[PDB]
Amino acid sequence: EPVDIGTGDFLQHFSVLSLPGSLPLTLSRFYRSQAKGTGIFGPKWTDEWSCMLTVHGNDMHFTNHEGVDLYYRIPQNGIFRDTANSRQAYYRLSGDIRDELTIFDRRSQHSQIFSLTDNGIYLLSAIHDRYGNRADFIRTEGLLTGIHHSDGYTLALGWQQRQLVSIDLATPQRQRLVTCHYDKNGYLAECDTIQFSHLWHEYTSEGWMTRWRDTDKTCVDIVYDTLGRTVSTLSTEGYFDDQFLYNDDEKCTTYLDAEGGETRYWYNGDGLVTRSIDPLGREETSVWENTRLRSRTDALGRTTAYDYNNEGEISRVSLPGGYSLYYDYNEHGQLTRLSAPGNQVWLWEYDGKGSMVCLTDPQGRQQQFSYSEHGDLLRQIMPNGATWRWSHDALHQVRATTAPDGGVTQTEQDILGRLLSVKDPLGYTTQFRYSKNHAGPQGSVEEIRRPDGVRELMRQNSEKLPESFTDGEGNTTRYEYGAFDLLTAVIRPDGERLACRYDKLTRLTEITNAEGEHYRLRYDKAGQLVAETDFTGRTLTYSYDAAGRCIRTTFPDGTHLNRQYSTTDQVTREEVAQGDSDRVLSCTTFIYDALSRLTEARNNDATVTYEYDDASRVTAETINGRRTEYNYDPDQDTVSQRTTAGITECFTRGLTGELTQWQIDGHTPLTLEHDLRGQEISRQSEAGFSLRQNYTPTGMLTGQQAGDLTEQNPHYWRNNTLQRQWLYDKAYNLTMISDSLRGTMVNSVTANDQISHATWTGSSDIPMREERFAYDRNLNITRRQTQVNGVPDSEAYQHQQHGRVTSREYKAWRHTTQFVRVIRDEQTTWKYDVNGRLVEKLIDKGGYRPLRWRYRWDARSQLTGLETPEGERREYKYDPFGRRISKRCTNRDRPGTDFHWNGDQLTEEIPVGTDGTPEYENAIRWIYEPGSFTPLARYEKGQLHYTITDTVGRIQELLTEDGTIVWRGKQHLWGREEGRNKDDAPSCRLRFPGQYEDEESGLYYNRFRYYDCEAGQYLCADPIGLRGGINLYAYAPNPLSWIDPLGL
């Protein structure tokens, strides 16, 4: 909003200064081209330090920080008392005109004092709160020259020929905050601020701003008509080449944006818009009542209404769909009650100074807050008794926090509020140093000193935007910007560029990856994304309704995905149609209750229902008849008990909400301990299972010990102990693993933090097994070579096209005695359909019959069918949320598997006989904490196994309750599992978080996509597009650093 539609005013509002304290001191500057007001920054600019009351006849005129005028009738006795004006009722004027006048703001509980000067004028002399925190304004020769804050600092304002040139922090420290210059006519020409922007301005003789610019890329030219109305803008880089048309007879203003769109506004006598029509013809109307908004109706006809109480606050909001929100206040305008549908009520209680001392939630639970005399929050008591405490520095910023467990976190900040140091409950200190660029452009550097010795650098440019980041190993990422602070380039530590380009309204239209290929986006006249074409040339098209809700997505093959919405913008129905026939191939329904809570989702393959309690907490999720029930801790809203098929689990949590005990089906419980930083140091079962874990100064998981709790009986726990250690480089890449069961692993990483060499060694210094990796410009795998005992074992080179693997050569060697000869030689080719889905993988094994895989998909790019080299057919089905619920062999003698879920967690794999009968009594239950993707236990036929997981949450060991190691994982870098376990050992198909191995394909099912752990890629494009990254097929650049549990 650069232009006031109701007047044609050019408008600008910029932050100037923001000083922390008990009473925060904030300053800004507001510009209006046709304004007549003056502030501390000269004519045409207004500010919060220049408000004044002036006598006009029998009225007092209040001039606020925008130049708006509110009138107050002077009482017969000349004494104001809680006097208000309905146009802005939150302002309350009190006081005798012969003494001093006070404006109380009901919105903030702050007060402004105005003192008599000259010609019936009351200038701003103080600001204070209800605790007495006060800022005094000192004026000499009529000019504001000093400010004294009760926290203990002072400001000095420097004037030259009655023009403000400087604002300085004077005591207890001397610091320049703002510097100003003016043109030949006295208008503010330049304003450099220490915390915010540094801008220049140019004006006509009347003060009409014809140009403004920043320090580098932004420069805008504004043109006015003879009446002072803004008619055009244009930035030097082309952005916002806009025009403005005015029809004062019709009271209509037209906005012609730089991309050909036309927006018409109809305004009232107060300049408020009563009706607008957007570039697509969509209309929105508003009803005003003396500058007070009473209703608003969108293009769909949905109306939101606002009622008000006798004091000017909103008392009722009527929402589309019959929902109303009620607001009640105390005599000072502080919200004391909020009433929402579903009989949800919040209560706030205030003491004599306006401090919020007690909050009552809809369930009647109370939170008590205790304050100091000057308003500092000192203590908070939660419903369960958990107590937080805070102390504060001289500027009333928090300097120490005591957690419910007594752990203390100390923070230190400077006068500008920048963080200087942090000492955690275990005494580890991180330091932050800042330094300004005194030479050249106005850059700055921030250095981070971590308690492990790591030093990191964070540089800013003259626009105070991130310019570069250098990690603890010296790798530097750089950033470049255009006008309006648009990110135009990212330069990776390896030197490669990622570029972005925008249209004349600053909407992103093109991304260029390091390879040089382009991802393009197209918009309609209203800014809605109507098309996008990825690097593979695949185009999707979108359609929206009158409220901007996407109602159709069109795929290259012709299919449409239609969506219908309820009045509350919730998807009620989804449909799949094909081509020119609007024939429905499938439909998915979503049903909601009277509180708009999803109660049933249904497609052709699954029905999912949800039950709720009065607090809208999910108490039951059912999937095709399989019901999981929940109970909740009454104080923490955490799951305290869950049951599926008669098997009940119990969750016990501490004051902070940490898991302290877990128990299932009457088995011996699992108890867990945490340290003062909240990190788990041990978990334990009296049956015998025991696991200790320790962390680095920055919280890295770095040590694990299992078995022999007290080192009392090493002979008894022989072959049932584990010592594991993880070491990291100064960029926090996992570079070394010590594992008492497997050996030692050493990793080398690239500047992109990608592993280029991984070596496992056991008892011989020569590495037993090595993996060597190379990557292309998009950080996708190219080369993989393996070595066994220092002998070349196999070599593969895969080739990407448009970011997805297309072909690969592979060869393997047999070792003769010292010689090597090729014993396997094969080329693989990948083939994708026009929608970006892998449809064929063909392996030409030289000297053999070819091996071919074929994949069938649905319109949502879900893998519905798989054909093997032998001709067998597997089939998969998914619920309305994309959760695979079943797996069937459609043409052989292979038992199927049903899948049960809790939210995003695969909780049960249920064997299905060839006659289709599920074997619920043989189900394998995986135990997760709710919301977590890391399993803690496994339950099958009354047998409980505990897990030990690595640094990414992957299972490495399964142990019985008494601590016997039964399963041992062994993986190649990118996830291929190949540990050899006993035949009777429990199966463990879980891999990386969210991944499940299908033994019929070797693929890892990963929620929304299937993962190829050999190519390191997914079998189709990311269904969320750019929102998952610019690598649409890649898994993660480093599989020991990042995870992707949803496959997105």
Side-chain angles (χ1 to χ4, degrees), residues 498-554:
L498 311 168
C500 308
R501 293 175 63 184
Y502 308 83
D503 67 11
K504 291 165 148 293
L505 295 180
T506 72
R507 295 187 295 257
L508 177 71
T509 60
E510 184 184 73
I511 297 182
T512 304
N513 59 20
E515 185 176 358
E517 299 190 348
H518 308 283
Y519 195 112
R520 304 180 186 278
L521 300 88
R522 186 169 63 89
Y523 305 90
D524 58 19
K525 300 295 185 193
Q528 301 178 134
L529 176 66
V530 293
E532 54 181 325
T533 303
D534 56 44
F535 308 109
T536 80
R538 175 185 65 119
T539 303
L540 309 179
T541 302
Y542 309 107
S543 298
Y544 307 83
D545 58 20
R549 306 177 302 198
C550 182
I551 56 177
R552 175 180 297 201
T553 298
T554 304

Coordinates of all heavy atoms in Angstrom, one line a residue, residues 498-554:
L498 N 22.6 -20.7 -7.4 CA 21.2 -20.9 -7.6 C 20.6 -19.6 -7.7 O 20.8 -18.7 -6.9 CB 20.6 -21.7 -6.3 CG 21.4 -22.9 -5.9 CD1 21.0 -23.4 -4.6 CD2 21.3 -24.0 -7.0
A499 N 19.8 -19.4 -8.8 CA 19.3 -18.0 -9.1 C 17.8 -18.0 -9.1 O 17.1 -19.0 -9.3 CB 19.8 -17.6 -10.5
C500 N 17.2 -16.8 -8.8 CA 15.8 -16.6 -8.8 C 15.5 -15.3 -9.5 O 16.2 -14.3 -9.4 CB 15.3 -16.5 -7.3 SG 15.7 -17.8 -6.2
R501 N 14.4 -15.3 -10.2 CA 13.9 -14.1 -11.0 C 12.4 -13.9 -10.7 O 11.7 -14.8 -10.4 CB 14.2 -14.2 -12.5 CG 15.6 -14.2 -12.8 CD 15.8 -14.4 -14.3 NE 15.3 -13.4 -15.1 CZ 15.3 -13.4 -16.5 NH1 15.8 -14.4 -17.2 NH2 14.7 -12.4 -17.1
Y502 N 12.0 -12.6 -10.7 CA 10.7 -12.2 -10.3 C 10.1 -11.3 -11.4 O 10.8 -10.7 -12.2 CB 10.7 -11.5 -9.0 CG 11.5 -12.2 -7.9 CD1 12.9 -12.1 -7.8 CD2 10.8 -13.0 -7.0 CE1 13.5 -12.8 -6.8 CE2 11.5 -13.6 -5.9 CZ 12.8 -13.5 -5.9 OH 13.5 -14.2 -4.9
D503 N 8.7 -11.3 -11.4 CA 8.0 -10.4 -12.3 C 7.9 -9.0 -11.7 O 8.4 -8.7 -10.6 CB 6.7 -11.0 -12.6 CG 5.7 -11.0 -11.5 OD1 5.9 -10.4 -10.4 OD2 4.6 -11.7 -11.6
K504 N 7.3 -8.1 -12.4 CA 7.3 -6.7 -12.0 C 6.4 -6.4 -10.8 O 6.4 -5.3 -10.3 CB 6.7 -5.9 -13.2 CG 7.7 -5.8 -14.4 CD 7.0 -5.3 -15.7 CE 8.0 -4.6 -16.5 NZ 8.5 -3.3 -15.9
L505 N 5.8 -7.4 -10.2 CA 5.1 -7.3 -8.9 C 5.9 -8.1 -7.9 O 5.3 -8.4 -6.8 CB 3.7 -7.7 -9.0 CG 2.8 -6.8 -9.9 CD1 1.3 -7.4 -9.9 CD2 2.8 -5.4 -9.4
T506 N 7.1 -8.6 -8.1 CA 8.0 -9.3 -7.2 C 7.5 -10.7 -6.9 O 7.9 -11.3 -5.9 CB 8.2 -8.5 -5.9 OG1 7.0 -8.6 -5.1 CG2 8.6 -7.1 -6.2
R507 N 6.7 -11.3 -7.8 CA 6.3 -12.7 -7.7 C 7.3 -13.6 -8.3 O 7.8 -13.3 -9.5 CB 4.9 -12.9 -8.2 CG 3.8 -12.2 -7.5 CD 2.4 -12.7 -8.0 NE 2.3 -12.3 -9.4 CZ 1.5 -11.2 -9.8 NH1 0.9 -10.5 -8.9 NH2 1.4 -11.0 -11.1
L508 N 7.7 -14.6 -7.7 CA 8.7 -15.5 -8.2 C 8.3 -16.2 -9.4 O 7.2 -16.9 -9.4 CB 9.1 -16.6 -7.1 CG 10.2 -17.6 -7.6 CD1 11.5 -17.0 -7.7 CD2 10.2 -18.8 -6.6
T509 N 9.0 -16.1 -10.5 CA 8.6 -16.7 -11.8 C 9.6 -17.7 -12.3 O 9.3 -18.4 -13.3 CB 8.4 -15.6 -12.9 OG1 9.6 -14.8 -13.1 CG2 7.2 -14.7 -12.4
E510 N 10.9 -17.7 -11.8 CA 11.9 -18.6 -12.4 C 12.9 -18.9 -11.3 O 13.5 -18.0 -10.7 CB 12.5 -18.0 -13.6 CG 13.5 -18.9 -14.3 CD 14.3 -18.3 -15.4 OE1 15.1 -17.4 -15.2 OE2 14.0 -18.6 -16.6
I511 N 13.3 -20.2 -11.2 CA 14.4 -20.6 -10.4 C 15.4 -21.4 -11.3 O 14.9 -22.3 -12.0 CB 14.0 -21.5 -9.2 CG1 13.1 -20.8 -8.2 CG2 15.2 -22.1 -8.5 CD1 12.7 -21.6 -7.0
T512 N 16.7 -21.1 -11.2 CA 17.7 -21.7 -12.0 C 18.6 -22.5 -11.0 O 19.2 -21.9 -10.1 CB 18.5 -20.7 -12.8 OG1 17.6 -20.0 -13.6 CG2 19.5 -21.4 -13.7
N513 N 18.7 -23.8 -11.2 CA 19.6 -24.6 -10.3 C 21.0 -24.6 -10.8 O 21.4 -23.9 -11.8 CB 19.0 -26.0 -10.3 CG 19.0 -26.7 -11.6 OD1 19.7 -26.3 -12.6 ND2 18.2 -27.8 -11.7
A514 N 21.9 -25.2 -10.0 CA 23.3 -25.2 -10.4 C 23.6 -25.8 -11.7 O 24.5 -25.4 -12.4 CB 24.1 -25.9 -9.3
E515 N 22.8 -26.8 -12.2 CA 23.0 -27.4 -13.5 C 22.7 -26.3 -14.6 O 23.3 -26.4 -15.7 CB 22.1 -28.6 -13.7 CG 22.3 -29.4 -15.0 CD 21.5 -30.6 -15.0 OE1 20.8 -30.9 -14.0 OE2 21.5 -31.3 -16.1
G516 N 21.8 -25.4 -14.3 CA 21.5 -24.4 -15.3 C 20.1 -24.5 -15.9 O 19.7 -23.7 -16.7
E517 N 19.3 -25.5 -15.4 CA 17.9 -25.7 -15.9 C 16.9 -24.8 -15.0 O 17.3 -24.4 -13.9 CB 17.5 -27.1 -15.8 CG 18.4 -28.0 -16.7 CD 17.9 -29.4 -16.9 OE1 16.9 -29.8 -16.1 OE2 18.4 -30.2 -17.8
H518 N 15.8 -24.6 -15.6 CA 14.8 -23.6 -15.1 C 13.5 -24.2 -14.6 O 13.0 -25.1 -15.2 CB 14.5 -22.6 -16.2 CG 15.8 -22.0 -16.8 ND1 16.5 -21.0 -16.2 CD2 16.4 -22.2 -18.0 CE1 17.5 -20.7 -17.0 NE2 17.5 -21.4 -18.1
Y519 N 13.1 -23.7 -13.5 CA 11.8 -24.1 -12.9 C 10.9 -22.8 -13.0 O 11.3 -21.8 -12.4 CB 11.9 -24.5 -11.5 CG 10.7 -25.2 -10.9 CD1 10.7 -26.6 -10.6 CD2 9.5 -24.5 -10.6 CE1 9.6 -27.2 -10.0 CE2 8.4 -25.1 -10.0 CZ 8.5 -26.5 -9.8 OH 7.4 -27.1 -9.2
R520 N 9.8 -22.8 -13.7 CA 9.1 -21.6 -14.1 C 7.7 -21.7 -13.4 O 7.1 -22.7 -13.2 CB 8.9 -21.5 -15.6 CG 10.3 -21.5 -16.3 CD 10.1 -21.3 -17.8 NE 11.4 -21.5 -18.5 CZ 12.3 -20.5 -18.6 NH1 12.1 -19.3 -18.1 NH2 13.4 -20.8 -19.3
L521 N 7.2 -20.5 -13.1 CA 5.9 -20.3 -12.5 C 5.1 -19.2 -13.2 O 5.7 -18.1 -13.6 CB 6.0 -19.9 -11.0 CG 6.7 -21.0 -10.1 CD1 8.2 -20.7 -10.1 CD2 6.1 -20.9 -8.7
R522 N 3.8 -19.3 -13.4 CA 3.0 -18.4 -14.1 C 1.8 -18.0 -13.2 O 1.2 -18.9 -12.5 CB 2.5 -19.0 -15.4 CG 1.8 -18.0 -16.3 CD 1.6 -18.5 -17.7 NE 0.8 -19.7 -17.8 CZ -0.5 -19.7 -17.9 NH1 -1.2 -18.6 -18.0 NH2 -1.1 -20.9 -18.0
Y523 N 1.4 -16.7 -13.3 CA 0.3 -16.2 -12.5 C -0.7 -15.5 -13.3 O -0.5 -15.1 -14.5 CB 0.9 -15.2 -11.4 CG 2.0 -15.7 -10.6 CD1 3.3 -15.6 -11.0 CD2 1.7 -16.4 -9.4 CE1 4.3 -16.1 -10.2 CE2 2.7 -16.9 -8.6 CZ 4.0 -16.7 -9.0 OH 5.0 -17.2 -8.2
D524 N -2.0 -15.4 -12.8 CA -3.0 -14.7 -13.4 C -3.0 -13.2 -13.0 O -2.1 -12.8 -12.2 CB -4.4 -15.3 -13.2 CG -4.7 -15.5 -11.7 OD1 -4.1 -14.8 -10.9 OD2 -5.6 -16.3 -11.4
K525 N -3.9 -12.4 -13.4 CA -3.9 -11.0 -13.1 C -4.0 -10.7 -11.6 O -3.7 -9.6 -11.2 CB -4.9 -10.3 -13.9 CG -4.8 -10.4 -15.4 CD -3.6 -9.7 -16.0 CE -3.5 -9.8 -17.5 NZ -2.2 -9.4 -18.0
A526 N -4.5 -11.7 -10.9 CA -4.7 -11.5 -9.4 C -3.6 -12.1 -8.6 O -3.7 -12.1 -7.4 CB -6.0 -12.0 -9.0
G527 N -2.5 -12.5 -9.2 CA -1.4 -13.1 -8.5 C -1.6 -14.6 -8.1 O -0.7 -15.1 -7.4
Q528 N -2.6 -15.2 -8.5 CA -2.8 -16.6 -8.3 C -1.9 -17.5 -9.2 O -1.8 -17.2 -10.4 CB -4.2 -17.1 -8.4 CG -5.2 -16.3 -7.5 CD -6.7 -16.7 -7.8 OE1 -7.4 -16.9 -6.8 NE2 -7.1 -16.8 -9.0
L529 N -1.2 -18.5 -8.6 CA -0.4 -19.4 -9.3 C -1.2 -20.3 -10.2 O -1.9 -21.2 -9.7 CB 0.5 -20.2 -8.4 CG 1.4 -21.2 -9.1 CD1 2.4 -20.5 -9.9 CD2 2.0 -22.2 -8.0
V530 N -1.2 -20.1 -11.5 CA -2.0 -20.8 -12.4 C -1.2 -22.0 -13.1 O -1.9 -22.9 -13.7 CB -2.7 -19.9 -13.5 CG1 -3.7 -19.0 -12.8 CG2 -1.6 -19.1 -14.2
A531 N 0.1 -21.9 -13.1 CA 0.9 -22.9 -13.8 C 2.3 -23.0 -13.3 O 2.8 -21.9 -12.8 CB 0.9 -22.7 -15.3
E532 N 2.9 -24.1 -13.3 CA 4.3 -24.3 -13.0 C 4.9 -25.4 -13.8 O 4.3 -26.5 -13.9 CB 4.6 -24.4 -11.5 CG 3.8 -25.6 -10.8 CD 4.1 -25.6 -9.3 OE1 5.3 -25.4 -8.9 OE2 3.2 -26.0 -8.5
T533 N 6.1 -25.2 -14.3 CA 6.8 -26.2 -15.2 C 8.1 -26.5 -14.6 O 9.0 -25.6 -14.5 CB 6.9 -25.7 -16.6 OG1 5.6 -25.4 -17.1 CG2 7.6 -26.8 -17.5
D534 N 8.4 -27.8 -14.2 CA 9.6 -28.1 -13.5 C 10.7 -28.3 -14.4 O 10.6 -28.0 -15.6 CB 9.3 -29.4 -12.6 CG 8.8 -30.6 -13.5 OD1 9.4 -30.8 -14.6 OD2 7.9 -31.3 -13.0
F535 N 11.9 -28.8 -13.9 CA 13.1 -28.9 -14.7 C 12.9 -30.0 -15.8 O 13.6 -29.9 -16.9 CB 14.3 -29.2 -13.9 CG 14.5 -28.3 -12.7 CD1 14.2 -28.7 -11.4 CD2 14.9 -27.0 -12.9 CE1 14.4 -27.8 -10.3 CE2 15.1 -26.1 -11.9 CZ 14.8 -26.5 -10.6
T536 N 12.0 -31.0 -15.6 CA 11.8 -32.0 -16.6 C 10.8 -31.6 -17.7 O 10.5 -32.3 -18.6 CB 11.2 -33.3 -15.9 OG1 9.8 -33.1 -15.6 CG2 11.9 -33.5 -14.6
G537 N 10.3 -30.3 -17.6 CA 9.3 -29.8 -18.6 C 7.9 -30.2 -18.3 O 7.0 -30.0 -19.1
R538 N 7.6 -30.8 -17.1 CA 6.3 -31.2 -16.7 C 5.5 -30.0 -16.2 O 6.0 -29.2 -15.3 CB 6.4 -32.2 -15.6 CG 5.0 -32.6 -15.0 CD 5.2 -33.6 -13.9 NE 5.9 -33.0 -12.8 CZ 5.4 -32.9 -11.6 NH1 4.3 -33.4 -11.3 NH2 6.2 -32.3 -10.6
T539 N 4.3 -29.7 -16.7 CA 3.5 -28.6 -16.4 C 2.3 -29.0 -15.7 O 1.6 -29.9 -16.1 CB 3.1 -27.8 -17.7 OG1 4.3 -27.4 -18.4 CG2 2.3 -26.6 -17.3
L540 N 2.0 -28.4 -14.5 CA 0.7 -28.5 -13.8 C 0.0 -27.2 -13.9 O 0.6 -26.1 -13.9 CB 0.9 -28.9 -12.4 CG 1.8 -30.1 -12.1 CD1 2.0 -30.3 -10.6 CD2 1.3 -31.3 -12.8
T541 N -1.4 -27.2 -14.0 CA -2.2 -26.1 -14.1 C -3.2 -26.1 -13.0 O -3.7 -27.1 -12.5 CB -3.0 -26.0 -15.4 OG1 -2.0 -26.1 -16.5 CG2 -3.8 -24.8 -15.6
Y542 N -3.5 -24.9 -12.4 CA -4.4 -24.7 -11.3 C -5.6 -23.8 -11.6 O -5.4 -22.9 -12.4 CB -3.7 -24.2 -10.1 CG -2.4 -25.0 -9.8 CD1 -1.1 -24.5 -10.0 CD2 -2.5 -26.3 -9.2 CE1 0.0 -25.2 -9.7 CE2 -1.3 -27.0 -9.0 CZ -0.1 -26.5 -9.2 OH 1.0 -27.2 -8.9
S543 N -6.7 -24.0 -11.0 CA -7.9 -23.2 -11.1 C -8.4 -22.9 -9.7 O -8.4 -23.7 -8.8 CB -9.0 -23.9 -11.9 OG -8.5 -24.1 -13.3
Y544 N -9.0 -21.7 -9.5 CA -9.4 -21.2 -8.2 C -10.8 -20.7 -8.3 O -11.3 -20.3 -9.4 CB -8.5 -20.1 -7.7 CG -7.0 -20.5 -7.7 CD1 -6.2 -20.4 -8.9 CD2 -6.4 -20.9 -6.5 CE1 -4.9 -20.7 -8.8 CE2 -5.1 -21.2 -6.5 CZ -4.3 -21.1 -7.7 OH -3.0 -21.5 -7.6
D545 N -11.5 -20.7 -7.2 CA -12.9 -20.1 -7.1 C -12.8 -18.7 -6.8 O -11.7 -18.1 -6.7 CB -13.7 -21.0 -6.2 CG -13.1 -21.0 -4.7 OD1 -12.3 -20.2 -4.4 OD2 -13.5 -21.9 -4.0
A546 N -13.9 -18.0 -6.5 CA -14.0 -16.6 -6.3 C -13.3 -16.2 -5.0 O -13.0 -15.0 -4.8 CB -15.4 -16.1 -6.2
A547 N -12.9 -17.1 -4.1 CA -12.2 -16.8 -2.9 C -10.8 -17.3 -2.9 O -10.1 -17.3 -1.9 CB -12.9 -17.4 -1.6
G548 N -10.2 -17.6 -4.1 CA -8.9 -18.0 -4.2 C -8.5 -19.4 -3.7 O -7.4 -19.7 -3.5
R549 N -9.5 -20.3 -3.5 CA -9.3 -21.6 -3.1 C -9.1 -22.5 -4.4 O -9.9 -22.4 -5.3 CB -10.5 -22.2 -2.3 CG -10.8 -21.3 -1.1 CD -12.0 -21.8 -0.3 NE -13.2 -21.9 -1.2 CZ -14.4 -22.0 -0.7 NH1 -14.7 -22.0 0.6 NH2 -15.4 -22.1 -1.6
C550 N -8.0 -23.3 -4.4 CA -7.7 -24.1 -5.6 C -8.7 -25.2 -5.7 O -8.8 -26.1 -4.8 CB -6.3 -24.6 -5.5 SG -5.8 -25.6 -6.9
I551 N -9.5 -25.2 -6.8 CA -10.5 -26.2 -7.0 C -10.2 -27.2 -8.1 O -10.9 -28.2 -8.1 CB -11.9 -25.5 -7.4 CG1 -11.7 -24.6 -8.6 CG2 -12.4 -24.6 -6.2 CD1 -12.9 -23.9 -9.1
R552 N -9.2 -27.0 -8.9 CA -8.8 -28.0 -9.9 C -7.3 -27.9 -10.1 O -6.7 -26.9 -10.2 CB -9.5 -27.8 -11.2 CG -9.0 -28.8 -12.3 CD -9.7 -28.6 -13.6 NE -11.2 -28.9 -13.5 CZ -11.9 -29.2 -14.5 NH1 -11.5 -29.3 -15.8 NH2 -13.2 -29.3 -14.3
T553 N -6.7 -29.1 -10.2 CA -5.3 -29.3 -10.6 C -5.3 -30.2 -11.8 O -5.8 -31.3 -11.8 CB -4.4 -29.9 -9.5 OG1 -4.4 -29.0 -8.4 CG2 -3.0 -30.1 -10.0
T554 N -4.7 -29.7 -12.9 CA -4.7 -30.4 -14.2 C -3.3 -30.9 -14.5 O -2.3 -30.2 -14.5 CB -5.2 -29.5 -15.3 OG1 -6.5 -29.0 -15.0 CG2 -5.3 -30.3 -16.6

